[PDB]
Every structure is written in C-alpha cells, then in structure tokens.
Design a protein around this ligand. Structure first.
Ligand SMILES: C[S@@H](CCCN)C[C@H]1O[C@@H](n2cnc3c(N)ncnc32)[C@H](O)[C@@H]1O
Ligand SMILES: C[S@@H](CCCN)C[C@H]1O[C@@H](n2cnc3c(N)ncnc32)[C@H](O)[C@@H]1O
Ligand SMILES: NCCc1ccccc1F
Ligand SMILES: NCCc1ccccc1F
Lengths: 294, 294
C-alpha cells in the first residue's frame, strides 16, 4: 500500500497500519530508485552521510535492509538454521531476493546447492545495482535463483528435497500474505527431509505477539516436532527487533544449543553479530513472551 | 538543545544530534506538559490510542519512558544489580526521578532504605501526575527522595555507605554530562561498601560504542574489579535498545550469572521482562560489541 509519499521533507517516514502510531524515520540524502514493480513498491535511497545507515531499501513502505545493520538478520537466519542441522547440503530460500541470507548460507562448506525463489525479480536486480555486498552471492554456481511465487514453488517440489528451508519474506500485507498461513507450512514440512530445519521471518514480540502464538501453534500442529522463537536486535525493523521461528521436523532436537557450532568453521571470525553465545541467548525471551518457547 | 519544536504535523519526532540522521516518531493525541524546568525541557504527551505506547515522556527531546515498555529498563537495572549482590540493604539511585527503578528495588525484601537524588524536581512531580504506575514508589517510607545534582550528592556522601548505586541518568548532553565522567565514578566507588555493585544508563552499542568502551576502561582504572555490559530490548530508546554497565567493587564477582536468583523471591512472577534466563542472556553481546565484556 504505502509508496513514494513516505518520502517528504528530506525524510523517509515508515508509517504503516501494521504499526499504527509510530514511524521510524531516516533522513534522505539522495533517492536512487523509486518505482512500482510488478508486485510491490520499491524505494532505495542513500541516507544522511552524517548518520551510519548508508543505503536503505523499502518494499511497500517497509524498511527491508540498510547497509549498517543488515548483517544481523542475515547472519541469524543463515547460521541459526544451518548450525542446528547435522549436515545441511540442500537449502531452500523463499523470498531473500536481496541475497543476504544466501550469502550467509553459502559460507557453510556442507552446502552443495541452494534454491532461491523470490516473487519480485526487480528486488534481485536493484540489490545487484545498489547493494553489492549483500547481493554478490546471487551469482554463485551453488545457487539457482528463480523469479516466482514461493507457494507455487513448494507445491511443485518433491517430498524430502531440502535439509533447510528459510522463509525470508516481507510482512503479511502484500504478496507474502499466504506464506504466513498453515497450508504453506504444511508443504514446507513435506519438502523437508526427516532431519530438516525451517526458519522464517517471524515478526515482532512487541507488535505481533498474537500472530507469533498462532503460527508457533499451527506449525507444531502441522507436524513439526518443535518450534522456538529466536529474538535479534535490528534497529531498522519496527521496534528494533525481529525474530525467527526455528522449527525441527525431527523429534528430540534442541535447536537452542548449536549442533554444529560456527566456531569450528573457518569463517566464524568474519561474522559481525552471530556466534554460539548469541545463538543460545536469542532463545531467552522477555517474561511476557517466554511462553512461545516454554 | 531541542524543545517544543519536535512536535509537528501531529507527531513527536525524536530528532537529535546525538543520533544524526534518524528519529523515532510517535503520533501525539494530546500534549499533557510542555515547558522548560529549572534544568531541562520536559514534554509529556498521550500517544495514539490506536497504538500501544500510552503516555510518553521526553527530556531535552529524548524519550525517557512510555507506558508500554517502561518495565524493561526498570526491571533490568533494579534486578540485575540487586540479584548480583549478596544482601543489598542500602541502595542509592542517582537520577531516576520517575521512580521506576525505585519501584523495582523496593520489591526486594532485603532493602532497608533507598535514597534517590534527581536534579529536576519537576520530573518527580509530573511522573506522579501522569505516570502513577511508574511513580507509585516515590513516597514509600523506605525511600528518601531529594532534589539535587547527583555529582554533589555522591561527593558529600561518606565512604562505605551503600550496597548498590544505580545511576539512572539522561544522555550526556545536558545536566547528566559529568555523571558519564571519571571523577563521578571515583566517588561512586568510594561510597560503595566493599562488596558493592553499581550500574548505570550505559547507552547504545549502535551509537555509542566508543563511549561505552571508554567508560568501561575508566571505571576499571578507578578501582572497580569488574565491569560487564548488559543489553536489553527497549523499542522507544534510540535504535531499540540500551545497556547498563554492571560493576563490582570486589574482585571475584561474576555479575553475569545471578548470585541470588529472582525465582527464589516471591515477586518473580510479577515481572514482565526480567528473569534469570534474561539476566544471563543480557550479557551475550553481538561480535562487534564483544570487546566491551571480553
Ligand atoms: C527483501 S527480502 C527481506 C529483507 C531481508 N533479507 C523479502 C522478500 O520476500 C519476497 N516475497 C514476498 N512475497 C513472496 C512470495 N509469495 N514468494 C516469494 N517471495 C516473496 C519479496 O519480494 C522480498 O524480496
Ligand atoms: C527520567 S530518568 C530516565 C528515564 C528512565 N527511568 C533520568 C533522570 O536523570 C536526571 N538527571 C540528569 N542529570 C542529573 C544530575 N546531574 N543529577 C541527578 N539527576 C540527574 C534527570 O533529571 C532525569 O529525571
Ligand atoms: N517490518 C519488517 C519485517 C521484516 C523483517 C525481515 C525481513 C523482511 C521483513 F519484511
Ligand atoms: N536516549 C535515551 C537514553 C536513556 C536511556 C534510559 C534512561 C534515560 C535515558 F536518557
């Protein structure tokens, strides 16, 4: 819904009815691209050089990435999921057209192939033009990048295809709407191998607690053995955090203690947020929310 | 620096040169107070009833408290410090004129008396008027509230007076400037008993990392045996978080694991954010910030 109008008087103001009454605002130095795509309104701007945020991307008015803080969400989804799997060789990313989660997934030496399926091919194009440090991964021969709806893709995929499925989507308003639903997760379960792990963009414990409760419950009811929400610090998502529901197909698995610590891997010291202490800490939730995890 | 001009368009915008290029914005339903005090510009407003934030207070344009998320910082400062001490009987709060930390300190049965010294008497008056759930503590018989500069109060206080000193101040621009300084901390060390603990308003890992490291350095140099930063999730502070440096006078103290777990206390079930799991998780820092704690 929201579009070009959110830039006004030198500021981008993230006003949205998904978070009534509040708006994170970033100063605009230069707009780089602002257009409707086939699916979403896409805005990329350079923020004020006197601030640290760098380039910023928003879809349907909702901030998706900035240069300064993108490493948090991308490291958390990519490493919390793959470090919870015994030997993740085949990975699926639904959404993620900016390439960030793919960049982090492809740090793991176990990965043989990752499919990435985003509905909006302009997101991949503009990420290659304006976010080269996030998009470099897209060209890698381990990846097959497709433009398509994630629901339709999973309905064409065989049972037991993937070790890990990562659902990196926009908010429920817009083309991601059915990806927050039970029918979609039914198929995600089916396309995972017996030891499979999924994680998602699991929204906010401040704004979306009821949805998190609802989704955590229906994902267990579809047949995942366990679901645990990992909370992470991201300044430029609404209220300064986001979470991911980390789900295990197989019973007896505790995703909250890494199974294959990143520290035993050669790229651990290049990460800017994630490590095994952060992984365990991410599943400790405020008392008001701790019931999500038990 | 800033004042009434941050309300415009029906919104309050937290523009500040302490965080250039960004601003949190809240919709204003009704201004409740807006004026210079003896020391600071104080603004209180009721936010959009369509949003969750409730009443909001700002000093010198910097959001201090909202009804919806105040319990996080108040619980973390009050309980992380007192649950790290073996028997905290005498406590000093510098700043904290809203009374939130004092509310939390006075849940502990060990506390005989808490002194609170805030430079701005108008903050206590307005917090009683407009934040009763936060200020419900100020007139307790276990508290003595005085209006004055915390710097002089700590200088005048005799050695070995307190078990815990909690420094709940505004940002360094303004009357709290010298409370981020080494001379103040020297007096804090002096007025603590030999097994004393202090903690403070420790600013942001995204905006202030250099300041945080400088403080941790000089607090150690003054003679505190250990200093560890605890991170917490507060949507309405800049970037969505803040921290506290929790410092022990005595050697041999690990404040990162609770000494007296709050679960053994009768009010644990009343808290909305803090518990032992959150206390331990708070000291896990993102890799980029990890050098604060080692
Ligand atoms: C930009 S990425 C999130 C930013 C942090 N990496 C979210 C992507 O989800 C895609 N998205 C939204 N709906 C769908 C569907 N139905 N299918 C696939 N991808 C989707 C959308 O086009 C974004 O590029
Ligand atoms: C409002 S409280 C922080 C909000 C979350 N409890 C911060 C207080 O610090 C006081 N403050 C600022 N400088 C000083 C000094 N020098 N001394 C005491 N109190 C001070 C200021 O008046 C606020 O009431
Ligand atoms: N409101 C932002 C929620 C979100 C978080 C992460 C990635 C995409 C995304 F849309
Ligand atoms: N910019 C907000 C920093 C802060 C945090 C907490 C209490 C007071 C305070 F000023």
């Amino acid at each position: 819904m929201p579009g070009s109008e959110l830039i006004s008087g030198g500021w981008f103001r993230e006003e949205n009815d998904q978070w009534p009454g509040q708006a994170m605002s970033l100063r605009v130095e230069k707009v780089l691209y602002d257009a409707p795509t086939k699916f979403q309104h896409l805005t990329i701007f350079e923020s004020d050089p006197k601030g640290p945020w760098g380039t910023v991307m928003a879809l349907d008015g909702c901030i998706q990435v900035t240069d300064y803080d993108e490493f948090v969400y991308h490291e958390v989804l990519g490493h919390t999921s793959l470090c919870s799997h015994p030997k993740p060789e085949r990975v699926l990313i639904i959404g993620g057209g900016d390439g960030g989660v793919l960049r982090e997934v492809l740090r793991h030496g176990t990965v043989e192939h990752c499919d990435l399926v985003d509905i909006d091919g302009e997101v991949m194009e503009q990420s290659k033009q304006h976010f080269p440090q996030i998009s470099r991964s897209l060209a890698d021969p381990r990846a097959t990048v497709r433009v398509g709806d994630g629901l339709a893709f999973v309905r064409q995929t065989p049972d037991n295809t993937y070790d890990v499925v990562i659902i990196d989507t926009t908010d429920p308003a817009g083309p991601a709407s059915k990806l927050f639903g039970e029918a979609f997760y039914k198929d995600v379960l089916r396309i995972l191998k017996p030891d499979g792990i999924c994680c998602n963009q699991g929204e906010s414990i401040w704004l979306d607690l009821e949805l998190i409760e609802k989704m955590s419950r229906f994902i267990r009811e579809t047949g995942f053995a366990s679901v645990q929400y990992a909370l992470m610090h991201v300044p430029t998502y609404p209220c300064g955090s986001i979470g991911t529901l980390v789900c295990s197909k197989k019973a007896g698995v505790d995703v909250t203690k890494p199974l294959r610590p990143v520290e035993d891997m050669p790229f651990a010291k290049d990460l800017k947020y994630y490590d095994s202490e952060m992984h365990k800490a991410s599943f400790a939730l405020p008392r008001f929310a701790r019931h999500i995890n038990n």
